[PDB]
Design an enzyme around this catalytic site. Sequence first.
Site, PDB file in Angstrom:
ATOM      1  N   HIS A 202      37.354 -24.022   9.077  1.00  0.00           N
ATOM      2  CA  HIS A 202      38.097 -25.163   9.601  1.00  0.00           C
ATOM      3  C   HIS A 202      37.220 -25.851  10.641  1.00  0.00           C
ATOM      4  O   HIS A 202      36.993 -25.299  11.724  1.00  0.00           O
ATOM      5  CB  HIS A 202      39.430 -24.726  10.203  1.00  0.00           C
ATOM      6  N   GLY A 203      36.714 -27.049  10.305  1.00  0.00           N
ATOM      7  CA  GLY A 203      35.950 -27.838  11.248  1.00  0.00           C
ATOM      8  C   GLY A 203      36.806 -28.856  11.981  1.00  0.00           C
ATOM      9  O   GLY A 203      37.914 -29.205  11.586  1.00  0.00           O
ATOM     10  N   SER A 204      36.277 -29.357  13.086  1.00  0.00           N
ATOM     11  CA  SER A 204      37.030 -30.355  13.829  1.00  0.00           C
ATOM     12  C   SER A 204      36.135 -30.896  14.931  1.00  0.00           C
ATOM     13  O   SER A 204      35.130 -30.276  15.294  1.00  0.00           O
ATOM     14  CB  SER A 204      38.325 -29.760  14.395  1.00  0.00           C
ATOM     15  N   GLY A 211      42.407 -27.529  22.790  1.00  0.00           N
ATOM     16  CA  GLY A 211      43.769 -27.398  22.301  1.00  0.00           C
ATOM     17  C   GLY A 211      43.911 -26.310  21.253  1.00  0.00           C
ATOM     18  O   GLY A 211      44.877 -25.543  21.266  1.00  0.00           O
ATOM     19  N   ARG A 218      47.769 -25.933  14.758  1.00  0.00           N
ATOM     20  CA  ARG A 218      49.159 -26.342  14.641  1.00  0.00           C
ATOM     21  C   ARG A 218      49.330 -27.278  13.452  1.00  0.00           C
ATOM     22  O   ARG A 218      48.365 -27.852  12.939  1.00  0.00           O
ATOM     23  CB  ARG A 218      49.649 -27.054  15.912  1.00  0.00           C
ATOM     24  N   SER A 244      34.091 -28.307   5.443  1.00  0.00           N
ATOM     25  CA  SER A 244      34.718 -28.242   6.757  1.00  0.00           C
ATOM     26  C   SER A 244      33.807 -28.825   7.827  1.00  0.00           C
ATOM     27  O   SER A 244      34.281 -29.488   8.758  1.00  0.00           O
ATOM     28  CB  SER A 244      35.094 -26.799   7.087  1.00  0.00           C
ATOM     29  N   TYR A 247      34.005 -32.438   9.040  1.00  0.00           N
ATOM     30  CA  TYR A 247      35.043 -32.857   9.974  1.00  0.00           C
ATOM     31  C   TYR A 247      34.665 -32.623  11.431  1.00  0.00           C
ATOM     32  O   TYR A 247      35.474 -32.927  12.314  1.00  0.00           O
ATOM     33  CB  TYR A 247      36.365 -32.158   9.652  1.00  0.00           C
ATOM     34  N   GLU A 328      40.511 -26.464  -1.376  1.00  0.00           N
ATOM     35  CA  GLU A 328      41.020 -26.457  -0.016  1.00  0.00           C
ATOM     36  C   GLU A 328      42.345 -25.713  -0.032  1.00  0.00           C
ATOM     37  O   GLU A 328      43.000 -25.611  -1.073  1.00  0.00           O
ATOM     38  CB  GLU A 328      41.165 -27.869   0.564  1.00  0.00           C
TER      39      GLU A 328
HETATM   40  O1  LIG Z   1      43.280 -31.215  11.863  1.00  0.00           O
HETATM   41  C1  LIG Z   1      44.063 -32.188  11.804  1.00  0.00           C
HETATM   42  O2  LIG Z   1      43.823 -33.338  12.228  1.00  0.00           O
HETATM   43  C2  LIG Z   1      45.428 -32.007  11.145  1.00  0.00           C
HETATM   44  C3  LIG Z   1      46.584 -32.157  12.142  1.00  0.00           C
HETATM   45  C4  LIG Z   1      46.807 -30.742  12.656  1.00  0.00           C
HETATM   46  O3  LIG Z   1      45.790 -30.344  13.566  1.00  0.00           O
HETATM   47  C5  LIG Z   1      46.664 -29.901  11.388  1.00  0.00           C
HETATM   48  N1  LIG Z   1      45.645 -30.652  10.628  1.00  0.00           N
HETATM   49  C6  LIG Z   1      44.963 -30.210   9.564  1.00  0.00           C
HETATM   50  O4  LIG Z   1      44.754 -29.012   9.406  1.00  0.00           O
HETATM   51  C7  LIG Z   1      44.456 -31.213   8.563  1.00  0.00           C
HETATM   52  C8  LIG Z   1      43.095 -31.378   8.337  1.00  0.00           C
HETATM   53  C9  LIG Z   1      42.619 -32.311   7.426  1.00  0.00           C
HETATM   54  C10 LIG Z   1      41.136 -32.479   7.189  1.00  0.00           C
HETATM   55  C11 LIG Z   1      40.618 -31.350   6.338  1.00  0.00           C
HETATM   56  N2  LIG Z   1      40.967 -31.348   5.081  1.00  0.00           N
HETATM   57  N3  LIG Z   1      40.532 -30.333   4.262  1.00  0.00           N
HETATM   58  C12 LIG Z   1      39.745 -29.296   4.629  1.00  0.00           C
HETATM   59  O5  LIG Z   1      39.417 -28.424   3.805  1.00  0.00           O
HETATM   60  C13 LIG Z   1      39.367 -29.281   6.042  1.00  0.00           C
HETATM   61  C14 LIG Z   1      38.577 -28.263   6.560  1.00  0.00           C
HETATM   62  C15 LIG Z   1      38.244 -28.257   7.889  1.00  0.00           C
HETATM   63  C16 LIG Z   1      38.688 -29.279   8.741  1.00  0.00           C
HETATM   64  C17 LIG Z   1      39.448 -30.296   8.249  1.00  0.00           C
HETATM   65  C18 LIG Z   1      39.808 -30.307   6.891  1.00  0.00           C
HETATM   66  C19 LIG Z   1      43.536 -33.078   6.728  1.00  0.00           C
HETATM   67  C20 LIG Z   1      44.894 -32.942   6.932  1.00  0.00           C
HETATM   68  C21 LIG Z   1      45.326 -32.014   7.846  1.00  0.00           C
HETATM   69  F1  LIG Z   1      46.664 -31.877   8.046  1.00  0.00           F
END
Ligand SMILES: O=C(O)[C@@H]1C[C@H](O)CN1C(=O)c1cc(Cc2n[nH]c(=O)c3ccccc23)ccc1F
Length: 351
Positions: A202-204, A211, A218, A244, A247, A328
């Site tokens: 899970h990237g971000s 947070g 969340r 991931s 992102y 995913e």
């Molecule tokens: O992260 C958020 O912004 C949101 C809101 C809250 O935090 C929960 N959230 C999500 O988990 C979310 C993420 C994505 C992007 C994404 N898609 N697919 C992947 O494999 C993946 C792998 C790693 C990082 C991102 C991704 C799309 C919809 C979502 F709901």
Amino acid sequence: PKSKLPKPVQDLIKMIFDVESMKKAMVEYEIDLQKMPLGKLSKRQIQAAYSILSEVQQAVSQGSSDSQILDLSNRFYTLIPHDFGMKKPPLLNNADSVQAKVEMLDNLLDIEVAYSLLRGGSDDSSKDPIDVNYEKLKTDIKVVDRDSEEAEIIRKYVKNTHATTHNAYDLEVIDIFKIEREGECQRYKPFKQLHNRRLLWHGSRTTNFAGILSQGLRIAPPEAPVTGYMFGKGIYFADMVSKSANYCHTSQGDPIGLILLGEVALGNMYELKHASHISKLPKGKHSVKGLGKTTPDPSANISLDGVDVPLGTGISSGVNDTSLLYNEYIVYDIAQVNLKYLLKLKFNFKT
Ligand SMILES: O=C(O)[C@@H]1C[C@H](O)CN1C(=O)c1cc(Cc2n[nH]c(=O)c3ccccc23)ccc1F
């Protein structure tokens, strides 16, 4: 006052609590810092923006004209002031534009949590602020020895699951952290023995990790439009590191990013090829799996602490007519995630 934390941990703390990084993300989304300063962010304002954005989404999908969409679009720019000077803002008349604003609100939520942590609490100049800010994460962070089997497994996972279509960069692992959020293990107990538990990426943006560590991953809040997420409001994971890693939103101007490895209790998977903006899973289903064209070689799966690691090289899944190039995984109960590792990554861009 010098902190006693390991140097990798101190640098990590400085990354996630970097205030100027939070401002840069807001500017990147075109927000007007003068009218919506970082310190003026509130969750209720963000939720109100979510609700307005839902009305725009309903109008967009139901086939409205620009005249009808205009009032709904203008309302959104009222709740979240943007930096357009004295010009009319861009009209939110299509689903893509609305999607961009959904993503913006997702990031503002985590930024508001991070800044709230910094501006809450106590101030003690006799302590190192790195130590003070570290304590606010309620997360135990340890550096994984580079020669440990954990490190070799994690590096191979990174090395093997970089997609060819993401070849504008390759990934170098700088630091590997073992993370343990307070109370998360207890929350995970009903799923700790469930079948189909996997270690997934899970990237971000780095600005979201204060947070994520303090509150965990969340689901988007109730006000968020379910149609703003391909498989509805859940927590999304990938088995290809590069999917991931995209992102993280790194660039030549900021090549350092953070990525998570979490144990995800998938269980019985609801397998889908195309968008499905669902509120709940069908009966007996524990997760959704978006079926990609490419999947890590199943025969290359290995076990780490009882959890399957799909670190095999990418091969064809045999799945035809799908919207996803790569898999995913989505869970709709936050209790089904137990975060395990946090990697600091250097992006070497080949462009
Ligand atoms: O992260 C958020 O912004 C949101 C809101 C809250 O935090 C929960 N959230 C999500 O988990 C979310 C993420 C994505 C992007 C994404 N898609 N697919 C992947 O494999 C993946 C792998 C790693 C990082 C991102 C991704 C799309 C919809 C979502 F709901």
